[PDB]
Design a protein around this ligand. Structure first.
Ligand code: NA
Length: 129
């Protein structure tokens, strides 16, 4: 599923991401825009052989099981395929564990490089929330 901007903001708010660990909703929408262009089916292969999945490009190295990432963990206790669902529950619940890991949203290199320090509230401008 490719979300609309405000559609995804509303889904992320309903799933409790707005100000989760102090990160306003615009931060999460911004991160999803640059990770996946709001496409739940986005996948990307990393140099190390791990794969990133879903709207927030969650990595198989630590967070999900894909059966093809040697020596990896599954700390969200999910198949990586659940992160591709039209239902964002699995991506949101796993993102809450990641952002709680110590480095906040710096876990998402695209958030650090494209969202951090910017006017992220622009991403939820105009939305009914
Ligand atoms: Na894994």
């Amino acid at each position: 599923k490719v979300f609309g901007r405000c559609e995804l903001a509303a889904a992320m708010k309903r799933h409790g991401l707005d100000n989760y660990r102090g990160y306003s909703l615009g931060n999460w929408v911004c991160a999803a825009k640059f990770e996946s262009n709001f496409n739940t089916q986005a996948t990307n292969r990393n140099t190390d052989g791990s794969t990133d999945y879903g709207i927030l490009q969650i990595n198989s190295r630590w967070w999900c099981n894909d059966g093809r990432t040697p020596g990896s963990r599954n700390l969200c206790n999910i198949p990586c395929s659940a992160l591709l669902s039209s239902d964002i529950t699995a991506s949101v619940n796993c993102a809450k564990k990641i952002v709680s890991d110590g480095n906040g949203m710096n876990a998402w290199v695209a958030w650090r490089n494209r969202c951090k320090g910017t006017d992220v509230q622009a991403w939820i401008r105009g939305c009914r929330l």
